[PDB]
Amino acid sequence: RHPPVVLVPGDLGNQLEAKLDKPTVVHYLCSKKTESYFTIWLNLELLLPVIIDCWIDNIRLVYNKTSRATQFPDGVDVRVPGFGKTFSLEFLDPSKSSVGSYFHTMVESLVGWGYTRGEDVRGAPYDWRRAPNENGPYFLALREMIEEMYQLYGGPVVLVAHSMGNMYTLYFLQRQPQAWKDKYIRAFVSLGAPWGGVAKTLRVLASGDNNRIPVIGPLKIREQQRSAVSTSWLLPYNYTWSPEKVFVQTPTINYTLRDYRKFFQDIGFEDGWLMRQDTEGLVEATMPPGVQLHCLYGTGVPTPDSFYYESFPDRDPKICFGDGDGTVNLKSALQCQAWQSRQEHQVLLQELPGSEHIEMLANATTLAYLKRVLLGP
Template identity: 45%
Template sequence: MVIDCWVDNMKLIYDEKTRTTSNSPGVDITVPGFGNTSTVEWLDPSQASPSAYFKSIANALVGFGYERGASLRAAPYDFRKGPHEQQDYFTRMRSLVEETYEKNGMKRVVLLTHSMGGVMSLRFLQLQTQAWKNKYIRALVTLSAPWGGAIKSLKVFAVGDNLGIFVINEGILREEQRSSPSLAWLLPSSMFWKTDEVLVSTADAKNYTVKDFEAFFRDIDYTTGWEMRKDVLSIANDFTYPGVEVHCLHGLGVNTIERLEYAAGKFPDGYPNLIFGDGDGTVNKRSLEGCTKWSQIGKKKNGRIYHQPIPGVSHMDILTDDRVLSYLRSLLSGKRRKIM
């Protein structure tokens, strides 16, 4: 009953006329803690250990001399919404950067992100002028950024995801998860997957590639998914260089969903056989390495690209890995060292 209530409260309602989403009727959801780090360090205000998020990194940064609420700030956002619905957030983030810069002796800001925060920050930087970025931004640091999306998003649309909690049925959470435009944003990009690569296969010889998402959503009886994908497609396909120095860290060597295979009679309502490849357990290798596409551009423009894979580190464990903390210490102290 608790899970059903949570799903009912958290799911978004899509309006095909406005091409935007809203909370369920009678539900008001806000994102607390903008500017301070409390709600990104812990996802649960009780600070129960399973809800730790940026806690280890924040503690390490304080150890490096940073101060919460002054030189160490946070910009939490509604992760359900697509980037086209985040205009107010981007405005607040710009103001937060400027305020932090001014409060700290005009020192340029380092943006530190995890997962979708990486592509959100990419979009934010794409919307700023180069003069503004030159003045206010020292670097963008991304941990586990899904630059080109992930095959796992297809799995979530099809059957849901239990977030690693084995006692929860994936199908129960699917209703809430698939209502998020951000999930449609993170579908595999045609800039990273070829149009002849099969992402979902069925025993009935009907296969789906990056060019078949409309048919995929129609066949799983969730056409809203295709409408949401159309809303974010131009942004998903905009891989313009952000115009700042980038430090791109991610795990590798962890089994990551590479393809969904349905046995006879199982599509679309049955459970697929999951075929695994390389990645960080959530995002595929080719997507994690997307930042390397900017390497030559960065040399010619406003900052280099530093790419650092970390073998054996998963999508979430990267937030507590000592090698990442050491890298951050070196970067913030003005040094750069390669993780061994």
């Protein structure tokens, strides 16, 4: 026998669909209207030059300074398919191409161990463009799904979260009563958690990140990346990083985590500061999840730590690297150790040397660890 499993993805980590009835478009070749939803992430054909402007216009969030909230562009809806199922987190591209293969290797393994897609293993995908403050309905659905799985399969559930999904899961758990967690949660397996933010968010917001895909201009994709509240939510936090650490250096100014207001002014994106204020307090830095926790973190992969700009903000910086998994800085991942003394439930730390941030989900060592958590001694 084996416990039910809920999978929580990270940023970019599940499909998104859009349906359009737009008053205006940025190019004539952009569709104003669709009769049904289509996949907006991940579909590679939408990211090609010129067409990418259509995509940005649909997938960007609009920040409303009055409500301090995001909304979709006029005539655009974006929905999250596959809640309670696994397809939309197994493959980011519904063509099922390897370029989008995310949770697929892990789900294959789980199924080989006796799990059933959509039944005792289920996904909890979400609109990862937002931070928890704008995903209230998702947390209600997550709570309900956990309760359902407990009742159906006769025991508490194991939460398995990747990257930003860990922060989503921690937010969720911090807000549930201890008695609820003791009944319904068996364990939380935390894979590549950026507990105190990731340093690369500074570069993304300042100058864009096209991830070495040269056919996408970094200044073009920067528009989308800035619009996503989740980007500013993942700026480094002072419970992980020194308030005096410089993340961004230019010829005339430094930026530390105490300098985000100046940073956002200086990059010409004042809304980002508002988004940071909206989101920075959502997860209490020092409250442990209050459940058995397995913190798995990659090391031995150069991980961007800080950025030097000769020309700010519209040129790519020089990058300084620290330890981590390529994305999540080792320091961030290690916030986990502080929780050992702050909850009664066990906190187990597991280093994964040489395990890159995304590859850790398909890695035999990761899967062997998960198997031990699920299937026992």
